[PDB]
Structures are given as structure tokens and as C-alpha cells.
Amino acid sequence: DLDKLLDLSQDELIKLFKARQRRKFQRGISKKAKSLLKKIRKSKKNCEPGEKPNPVPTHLRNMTIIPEMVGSIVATNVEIKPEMIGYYLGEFSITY
Amino acid sequence: QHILRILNTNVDGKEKVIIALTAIKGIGKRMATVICKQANVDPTKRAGELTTEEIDNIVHIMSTPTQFKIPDWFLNRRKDLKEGKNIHVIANQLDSYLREDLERMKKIRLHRGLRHHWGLRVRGQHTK
Amino acid sequence: RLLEPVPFVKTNNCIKDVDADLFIRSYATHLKLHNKITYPKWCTFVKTGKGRKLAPLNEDWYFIRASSILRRLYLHPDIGVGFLRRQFSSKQRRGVAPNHTSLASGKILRSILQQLENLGYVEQNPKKKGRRLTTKGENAINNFARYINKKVYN
Amino acid sequence: IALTSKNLRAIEKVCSDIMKGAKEKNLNVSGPVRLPVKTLRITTRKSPCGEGTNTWDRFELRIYKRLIDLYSQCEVVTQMTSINIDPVVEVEVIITDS
Amino acid sequence: VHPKKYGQGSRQCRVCSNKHAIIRKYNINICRQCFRERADIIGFKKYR
Amino acid sequence: EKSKLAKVEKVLGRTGSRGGVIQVRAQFMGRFLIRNVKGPVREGDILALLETEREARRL
Amino acid sequence: KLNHAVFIVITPSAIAEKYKVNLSVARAVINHLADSQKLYT
Amino acid sequence: KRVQTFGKKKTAVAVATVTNGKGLIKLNGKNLDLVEPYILKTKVYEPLWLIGSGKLKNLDIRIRVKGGGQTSQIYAIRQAIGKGIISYYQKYVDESTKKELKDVLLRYDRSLLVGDTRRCEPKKFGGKGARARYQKSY
Amino acid sequence: DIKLFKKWSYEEINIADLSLVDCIAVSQKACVYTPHTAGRYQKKRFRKALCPIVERLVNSMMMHGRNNGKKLKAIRIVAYAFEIIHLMTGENPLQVFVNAVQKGGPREDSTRQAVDVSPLRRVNQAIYLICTGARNAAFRNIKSISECLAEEIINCANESSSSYAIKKKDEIERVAKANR
RNA sequence: UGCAUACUUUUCCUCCGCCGAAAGGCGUAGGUAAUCUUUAUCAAUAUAUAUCGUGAUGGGGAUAGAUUAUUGCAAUUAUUAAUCUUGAACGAGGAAUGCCUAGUAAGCAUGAUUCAUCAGAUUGUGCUGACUACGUCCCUGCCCUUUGUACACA
RNA sequence: AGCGGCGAGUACACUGUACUUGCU
Fold first, then answer.
1. Residue with CA nearest to J120's C1' atom
2. Spatial distance from the CA of I157 to the C1' of J8 (Å)
3. Which of D84, H100, I5, I118 is the most buried (most CB within 10 A)?
4. Residues H120-136 as b or e (16 or more Cβ within 10 Å = b)
5. For residues D28 and D98, what is the distance between their CA atoms, to the nearest angstrom?
6. At residue C112, what are phi and psi to the nearest 5 degrees?
7. Looking at domain C1-154, which of 1.10.10.60, 2.60.120.590, 3.40.50.140, 1.10.10.10 is its CATH number?
8. Do A11 and A22 form a contact (C-beta atoms < 8 A)?
9. Domain H1-138 belongs to what topology?
10. Segments making up each domain of chain B, as ranges
């Protein structure tokens, strides 16, 4: 199911994705998102699989999500799922 | 002759055949237009002499037109990202897939999800 | 009804002395009879232009357009695709937004131009970059126009 | 030899100079080319604050350009033009042969 | 800093040094506020 | 019903609540007749009369 | 609410009023009899 | 031999030239019948019946049109051909018939020889309309 | 010599009301092959009447909501209506229109007290009732506009009760007679 | 791929020939400009002929879903956008209220402004050229004279 | 930018025309 998405490369990833994320990924990912990626990978590899990993500090609203980014939440508690991937996050002050 | 009742209302006898198969569904006049083209019905005729053979031809056409030249872009609901592919899905049952798409976006419960849930438009009616 | 008393001497030496409206339909009928060009199959599933938002609803629109582009080719001998798109451009209703003019789809015109080049009625050259008619096609259309003129004359 | 300016009297006196000089030097010269005037405009709003009736004004700069051609020495022509020219006018040069 | 070669951040009014109401007609690149009074000496003479 | 001829020998004045009436002397045969007319009337116009000895009011 | 059909001066309006038909079917009947608007024959 | 006249009615502009020939009157590359509006074909025919097809049988009048709306170029060509026939009568064919020709032209209409000065005025301030400004609410 | 649409030089014209003929001013000066005479029309007061009655008619069927400016379609619609009037009634439709204008316009109105109606104003106001009647007849009633004007023109020429112009003229004259 | 270093100009409109329905993309003509876009012509109202033939209809497009591409490092509060599906009110509008006298009303478009991208905004331009006065003070708003004031921040 | 004139025509008229090339 999601194992294929986990193993496939960036070309098949963008092909499965819509044109918006294709354009975004082709234009670039930026060192901020790269550092966030490596930090979240370290946090997930260090965290116990039996508990949900913590959110990310220095919050920002403009990175996409990858099924390899799973387990992430936002410091707004919707756990990321494969059917939420092509949206970014948002989740800011919209309080009623 | 006139007044033919099928899965959807087709009381269209005197009105044209093309407008009849647009009114049954595909009211955007393109699914119905291409279905008429594939089934080879002359628009010059009316809907009062539609035959059951042509109706069966119409159902043969709309049953997965993917094998037909109807392209993926012209196919309604092109991707609907998942493990598979979908198609234009006619009328009453067609409503079921937008129902379950609404369910998927509800369980997604993102900003646009709650905007649709609480009773707001996607872009905002702007009551400012 | 379509004929009127003309108080001046005509010329009838080419297509420019005959009406377009009947020329397009007559030469589309001639094209259908002679099977000079294909339909083709691929073009009949798409609207002519973005602003049209509906099918041509005539089934002979390709042939009706081909003769019109031939007429335009003679009217001024430099034809590109931008000029054809602008000429066959149409108004577009953007829903709640005001009506705005938009061009027609250029792929059908590109295909028509390629088919006309295959037929050899039109040729491409660096000088006079726009499409222009060959001498053979010019004299053939002259004789055809005179035939149509005489047919509608007597 | 073409000229460009913003004030028409300047180009008028400059042209009046070159025809008389050409007739003095008895050399073949084209007639005075009276180019269409090209006008530059912009519209802005008065009332720097946002209060009051909205009032706008337009501006207009028509630029005078004229052409001429002469068969004469590039040095004598530039010397005479520099003698009888003003900094407001800007002049370029091109020669003919027949 | 994070400078960009586009938008209001790329360039500003030369005399008033503000980011608001800057015209780009004919590369005037000046704000209308001071352009109103500098128009006459620039040459922008009003006729209508 | 019926209408009768009338010779506009001269114009008199533009009166009325909104200045929408014109005093004009008419003529069928009673030579001297006073009428009120709506609409543009020039010198030498023929008008239609409904009553014989019904006179207007001169201001 | 239209009620006319095709089952049973040549101007389309007059024919439509005479035979209680729509303008399209009236024009079709006009073609059938003879064999948008134009000058009368 | 060759006479040339001009035409300006409304925004459109036209050029006429009357030369000896056999009655070849051509508008650009087309004929006057191919304009499409028979309503304006009547307008171009109006001068012709006022002069004479027999007298036109030996004159060729070329016409060019560049710009303006349909009514503009029909009126422009009407007045241009009027001026062309008047001038070419004054020059070449005869002068005795020219006085009667111009008398007929003026006693029929003055718009044939000279057009109107009416043209679009500059759009004013205030609102979308030229002589009207935006709706205001108290 | 000069014929309307190459057909009618109208060599015969009724005496009418001895004033509306001069008001309409149909003559060799006003003779025209086709409608849409774009001459000056707001120069003087008598200039309004100097316009041909046919041009007055073709210049006023245009107004109904969204169809402003559309004048050539009005010309074609009145041409088709004129042909329809000829085919339905053998007499000359130009004389039909002349009878319509001479027996359609109200003659005495009331403002404050009743007043007369000028010959010129009577002609334009008659045209105006023809306009409103035709607009109502075309206002979502199946039948085409040319047939609408044909019916209304023939009705007001024959003073028929099916003529909105005649009905409103009668209403206005009744009010005027009641007032004065 | 990233940093440093040298080479032309890529940094505007674009014509064209091609890929893609299109959006959009590739490589080049031309132009610092009456010279190339484009101007012997860039829009629309029309126009001539077909279908519909006044039935909330096929009118009408509020509404949401699926996407392909560009703009922008970044579009999620789906900028913009081609396509498909979706199908609200609306039978011409109470009391009131705005605008207007000839190329003007009105309709139809379209140029430019800010603009990396986004006009439903504003400011020019043109086409289609109208019905009606050619005056009046009835309202309203001003102006003048006389008049009465115990008002003068009137 | 235009009016032309002629240098060669593409098809028809007949005892120039629509479209192409260059100069004055």
C-alpha cells in the first residue's frame, strides 16, 4: 500500500503527485526544508515506535510532506496521513 | 413514441435527442455530446424515436469509455489520487463518489474541510 | 435573392471578385466530394476554441474552415498561426466576470496548415515568412473561382 | 541628419538654418521631412491625502523629430550645426550618395 | 537580509524613499506625491 | 371623434406648471380663437381643435 | 408550456399559428410544401 | 488621364482615383457589391443614379479603405466618389454637364459632397460615461 | 424616379390632416432607398419634423432594455414587417403607415385642464405608442417582431381595437375630454 | 548537485515553425521603435446562414469536487489558469434614490495604471448613433431685493 | 507613408484587372 510510495524515487513521487508539488519539487526544496527533514528523521529514529513523535520547533507553514515524513505533528494535532500529503500543513490561528 | 422512462427521467419526447441525453445526465453537454458521437446518432433527429438498441449502445459507451478515444483529460475526475484510476460516472450512483470524496475530506479535516463543514465557501462569501 | 443587380463592370479574374460566404460552402462541398483531406478523427472530440465552450454542431466544420483559411491566404499572402487564431478568436463568458475576447485553439489550425502543405496548395519560404499560395494552386483557384462565378452567373 | 527636441521653435530655427546653408553651398538636399508628432502622457491624482473628491490631471509632452539628407562633408556639416545649435536640440547625422 | 529583484522591495521612490504609490510609466521610478510638484520642472506640462 | 383645422398665426407665450403649455391663436373659420397646445409649434402650423367656442385663459 | 407537435401565406409565424405548431416544425413543413428569416418568395 | 481625390467621413478615410477606362470601379481588391450590407449598397448606388451609368461607362474609379466602422467607410467612400466624379468632370469629360451634375447633387443632399464634423469627444472625468459621473449615495 | 427599396416612388399620397403631411415631409429631398439616414437631427426645431416618417419609425423600435444601439437589425425588422404588410394586405404599406400616423396620434391631452397637441409632437408620440405597443407584443409572446409591427401598424391604420396605439390615444382623449 | 572563478547576454513586446485541445513549452526574424509585435489592421456590439422556437428551458451561472501549466524560493487562505463534473436565485424588481440633451444616453468592447502573478477598480480610445424637449420655477439647491428678528459658535 | 510610371509575369478579357520583383 504505502510501501511502494516509501521505496519509489522522486520522479515517480512527483508523477504520482499533482502538478503543484511537481513544480515545487522541480524548482527546489531549500536547505531549511532539508535540515527539517534530517532533524525529523533523527527524531523519528530515536523516538520509541509505540508513541507519537513530538512536533517541530521554529514553526513555519510552507513545507510539503512525504510519506517518509510520517509520524509528524505540529506545535493543531492532526497526524499526517498519506491522503493529506499534497497540501502542506497550514494549521494556524483560525480560532472561532 | 414519446415519453420514455429510464433510470433517470427522460420524458423528453418532443425536445431534441441531444438535449435529451444531456438532460438525463452530463448536463455540461460534453459527456452527452461525445456519447452521442460514439453511439452515432444524428442530431437532426429528435428524442421521440430513440430505440432500446441505441440505449444499449449508450450504456456500452458509458461503461468505461477508457478503451474509447475519450482521453484522460476529458475523463471527469481524472486522478483522484489513490492506487487506481476513476472515470466519469453518470448520475445517481455518480453522486455516491462525491459523497465519499466529501467523507474523505471530512476525515482529512483540514482548513477547507472545516470551512465546508461549518457552512462556508472555499474562497469565502466575503461578508466583510 | 442572393444575387443583386450590379451597376458597374466586374472582373471575375480570381477569387477576390467572388463572395466569400458561398465560396467557403461550395469549396467545402468540393473538398468532401474529392476527399482531398482527412476529417481527421482526432479533432472532432474538442471544441474549436476555449471561449466557444461548445461543439461546432455541424460535422463539416473542418472542411468549412479549410476553405476560409485558403481565402485568407489569398486575401493577404502572409499567413502565420497567430493571425489565424486572432481572426477566428471569439468572445468568452467567464461566468460572473465580464465577457472577454480569447483566441481559438491553434492546434486545429496547425493541422489544417500541415494538411494544406501536404496537398501542395501552400508553400513555406524564409522570405515572405507567412504562408503563401504556390503558382499551381493560384491558377487552379483562379479557374475554380471562375467556374463558380459562371455557375452562379448563368 | 535628424533632429529631436521638445520645443518647436528650436527645431524651426534649426531647420531654417540648414535649408539656407544648403542653398548657400548649392548641394543636393532632400525636402524638409515633417514627421508625425509623438506625444507622451501620464495621468495622476491630486490630493495627496485620501480625503475629498477624487481629482486627476494629465500631462502632455509632444516630441518634435524631423529628417533631412545632404551630400556634403561630414566635418563641415557638424561644424556648422555645432555653430548654430543649442543644447536643448539633439541631432544625429546620416549621409547620402545620390 | 533577503533582497529580491522583483516587486516593491526591488525598488522604491527616489526622493521620498517610500514603498507606496510608485509609478513605473516610462521608468519615472518616482512617487506621485513629489512627482506632482516636480512634474513642471521635469517637463510634464498639463494641457488637459 | 372629430378634429378641426387651426392656423397658428403667432405664438403668444410658454406657460403652465412646468412651462409645458403654449398659448396660440387658432383658426377654423372662428378667426379669433385661443388655444393651449403641447409640443413644439413653429410659425405656420396647422392644429386640431376639439370644441368650437371653448376658450382658454390668457395670462 | 409547449403543447404543439408535428403530427397532423407560407411565412413561418402564419403557418405556426394556422397549424398550432412550433416554429421549427413549421419550417420543416414549409420545406416539405415548397419542395434565419429571409425575403418572402 | 488620372485625377485623385480624398475622403474623410466619420473616423474612416478613403482615397479615390478617376481614370479613363470601361467602368471598372473597384473597392480595394473586391467589388462594391461584395460589401455584404445591401443597405449600404443602396447608399453607394445613390450617387450613381444621380450622375449616370452611361457617363460612368468610360471611367474607372479605384477606391481604397483603411480604418473606421462600417457606416464610417460607407459614408467616406460615398463622399470620396462624389468628389472624384466632380473633379474629373471639371477636368476631363465636360464642363457643361458638370454644373447640372453638381446642381442635382446639392438639390438631392449636401452630405454627398462634404461629410459631417461629428466625432467622439474626449472622455470626461467623473465616471464611466462621458457626460455622466458615478452614482452617489447620501 | 427614386424608389423606396427600388420599389416605391410613392407617386400618390393622401391629403391626410393637412398638417401631418408637412410634418412627415416625405419628398424627393427625403426620398431614400433604405433607412438609416445619419444626417444631423438636433439642429433646429423644424429639423425634428424634417426627418422622414419612415426614418422616425426605424429609429425608435430599438429601445427595449438591452438592445440599445442595434439599428441595422431594427432596419431589417421593419423591412420584413413592411413585406409582411404587403403580403397580408395588397395595398401599399407606405400608405398604410401614413394612415397609421394620421389616425394614431393623440390630439388633445391634459397636464394640470386640457391642451392641444402640436402636429410634430403628435407624430412623434404616435410613433412612440407604436413603439411601446410593438415592444409589448414582442415581450415574450412567441410571435416575431416583424409580425408584431405588421399587426400593430395595420390595426392602427384601420383603427382596430387590437391596436395599443389607438387604445392609448382613445384613453388619453377620454381623460382630456373628462378634464376639459 | 553546491561554493569560487572567466566568457555572450537571458533579464520587453514578440512574429514564426514546431510539442501540448488548451493552459503552457522549445529555437530563432524584428524592433530602444510611423521600421518588429502591428496597424493594407489587434476587440466587440453586428453581420449572412443553420439549431433551438420563450417550456426556470438548452436560458442563467451562485455552488463544490477532480486536474493539468505557468507566475512567484515560497499560491495552504485550492493566486491565476485550459478541461470535465456540479445547476442557487432570477418572469425585470416596495418605499425611496441616482444620471442625462447629440457622436452625448445606453450597449458593446478595448488601451493604460499599480503588476513577478492577479481588474469585477480607476483613467483614456473606438464601434453601434436613440425617444423627447429647445422650456419652467413645482420640488430641491443656490443667488438678488425687500422685510422681521430677543440669532452672531449665527 | 503615399500617388504614380515601367522591368518580368501568375489567369481572364481584348482592337486592364486580383496577386508577385526593382528603381525613379
1. C97
2. 85
3. I118
4. eeeeeeeeeeeeeeeee
5. 9
6. -60, -45
7. 1.10.10.10
8. no
9. Ribosomal Protein S5; domain 2 (3.30.230)
10. 1-71, 72-128
